[PDB]
Amino acid sequence: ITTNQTGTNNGYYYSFWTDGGGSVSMNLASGGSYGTSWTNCGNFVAGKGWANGARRTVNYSGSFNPSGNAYLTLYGWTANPLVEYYIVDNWGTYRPTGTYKGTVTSDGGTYDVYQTTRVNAPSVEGTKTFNQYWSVRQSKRTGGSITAGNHFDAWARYGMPLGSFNYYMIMATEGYQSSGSSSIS
Amino acid sequence: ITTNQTGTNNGYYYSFWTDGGGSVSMNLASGGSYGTSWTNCGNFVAGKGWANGARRTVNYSGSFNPSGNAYLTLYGWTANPLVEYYIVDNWGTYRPTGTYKGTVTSDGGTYDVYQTTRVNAPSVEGTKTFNQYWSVRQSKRTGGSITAGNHFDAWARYGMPLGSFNYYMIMATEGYQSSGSSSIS
Amino acid sequence: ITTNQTGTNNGYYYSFWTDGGGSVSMNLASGGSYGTSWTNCGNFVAGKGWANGARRTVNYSGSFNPSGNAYLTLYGWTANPLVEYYIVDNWGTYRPTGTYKGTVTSDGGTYDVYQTTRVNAPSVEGTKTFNQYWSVRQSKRTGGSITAGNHFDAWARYGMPLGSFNYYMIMATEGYQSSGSSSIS
């Protein structure tokens, strides 16, 4: 596919979004599998996952090959409160950051946790003000387990409460003003 | 009444305070009912409620007619720690704000929550440094239910702990450098 | 002793550290008892306590006589997350401070709680970025009970989570660019 959309493929939720910039394509493959390719994109988010978020152990594998800024990250939203969350296992030429809260250790890795506030920004609920919660792995990797709940709990300990899992949770490839490819199952 | 004071009226706690500025009066009426009138005030706080705060469902009705800056807000203090809290349903020409923490949804509305710190400021415990917790309704209204505990819990999730309800909780009219009136039960 | 080191004395853990500056000595005495003496030091930390932190009631007595900057403080570290904590009962010409979070009341006193972030700083885990949690008594004293858990719980309420007590907890004398002495049991 090449146009913004949502749906199920091979029993798996999937979502594709781009701001029109450059060229971006997403391959929908067997089971939970997908890939992406892009050239001088503006912004895009793509991945496979679940229609609804949840406390789950997210297992993933593949390849991630960015030329410029891109993230490899679990990605989702909650409602009440509205919040966009990231748990980033890998990234390109830019490391995602924000207001430093601390750290969480999970799945053999240590992630820095950050918080940022988007003011009157696009969201699943429209133009809104909301918080972004981040966990960014201190060391890059492609593949393994991401035990979502360990992040959720740690964020809660740092005063970062999550709402209702009324929206998706995808294992996403996201890029900004760059090129590259990914293939993840 | 027209002079700073505290007491019970019709079985209800009540409190009146002004910094002397302009003219401010408070009507003590049947049951939980009161009203206020004021002209070019400096600062005043007035309302009816409880001698002691608590997890309760606060039901209120009436009219709120500010000409300038005024708030219509549940208002109280705790000890250990000392904290001044607001849950603002309505306001005048100024919207109460502070350090953005997030949001809480309750009683059919969505309130932004904010935190501010008063340094060496007047309090129920004298000149003190302390935090103010806010919930400010995203849309103005006069009347309904304010389920206090929903705010308390959300604030707690955002790292905003409340102390002991050693002081009042009133459904208050508060004004600053302005005129107007209110009538609330 | 006069050289950086760790060990047990009279059944009590002990730790001594200095950055070489000026002259600093530590007396290891009976039971939990120690003392320190120093002249124009740079930085030093010394005290007696436990190899491992814990929720305990820490009882201490003695004298604390700083000429310049020094703290009298319970002092420890956790892992996962890595955090350096202080609960300061007394200090010299400088009052320890940071980002104001609020207060906690314990052992007949009221402490301000603060948080600071050390970026790429020395720690028990090496050069690291980490948070420091503080409780600083509003009034100076030498002697009494410090119920550690009351601080731990309050910090948790303020979004300041503690990790695993994989490291020491000492009742410490710490100085910076100054002189003085202490004797504490």
DSSP string, B119-167: EEE--TTSSEEEEEEEEEESS--S-EEEEHHHHHHHHHHTT----B--S
Whether A80 contacts chain B with CB within 8 A: yes
Tell me the resolution in Å: 2.0
Residues from chain A that touch B159, judged by Cβ atoms under 8 A, are 158-159
Which H or E run contains C126? none
Which residues in C79-166 belong to E strands, given as ranges?
Answer: 83-91, 99-106, 109-121, 128-137, 144-147
B90, B96, B99, B100: CA torsion to nearest 10: 30
> Which region, left, alpha or beta, applies to residue C37 given φ > 0 means left and ψ of -120 to 50 means alpha?
beta
Distance from CA of C115 to the nearest CA of B (A): 13
Q: How many CA atoms lie within 13 A of B50 on its CB side?
A: 17
Q: Phi/psi of residue B55, each to 5°?
A: -70, 95
**What count of other Cβ atoms lies within 10 Å of the Cβ of residue C171?**
25
The fold of the A1-185 domain, in CATH, is Jelly Rolls (2.60.120)
As given in the structure block, the two tokens for residue B159 are: 């790292």
Contact (Cβ atoms closer than 8 angstroms) between residue C6 and residue C136: no
Length of chain C: 185
Counting one residue from chain A and one from chain B, the pairs whose CB atoms sit within 8 A come to: 24
User: How is residue C171 annotated by DSSP?
Assistant: E
Residues from chain A that touch B154, judged by Cβ atoms under 8 A, are 161
**What count of other Cβ atoms lies within 10 Å of the Cβ of residue B139?**
10
Q: Phi/psi of residue B104, each to 5°?
A: -145, 140
Which of B117, B158, B159 shows the shortest C-beta gap to C100?
A: B117
Distance CA C49, CA C46 (A): 10
Contact (Cβ atoms closer than 8 angstroms) between residue B151 and residue B104: yes
Contact (Cβ atoms closer than 8 angstroms) between residue B16 and residue B4: yes
Hey, which residues 128-157 in chain A have their CB within 8 Å of chain C? 154, 157
Residues from chain A that touch C157, judged by Cβ atoms under 8 A, are none
Q: What pairs with residue A47 in β-bridges?
A: A15, A172
Distance CA C14, CA A143 (A): 44
Q: Give the list of residues 6+ apart from residue A48 with CB closer than 8 angstroms, or none.
A: A9, A12, A13, A14, A28, A32, A33, A34, A170, A171, A184
Contact (Cβ atoms closer than 8 angstroms) between residue A163 and residue A62: no
As given in the structure block, the two tokens for residue A17 are: 């979004």
Length of chain A: 185
CA distances from A139 to A151, B70, B86, C78, C121 (A): 16, 52, 43, 22, 19
Residue with structure tokens 């995602």?
A96
Whether A159 contacts chain C with CB within 8 A: yes
Distance CA B78, CA B52 (A): 9
Among residues B66, B91, B93, B96, the alpha carbon closest in space to that of B182 is found at B66
Distance CA B54, CA C94 (A): 40
Q: Identify the active-site residue in B92, B174, B179, B183.
A: B174
Among residues C112, C105, C150, the alpha carbon closest in space to that of B79 is found at C105
As given in the structure block, the two tokens for residue B169 are: 């909780």
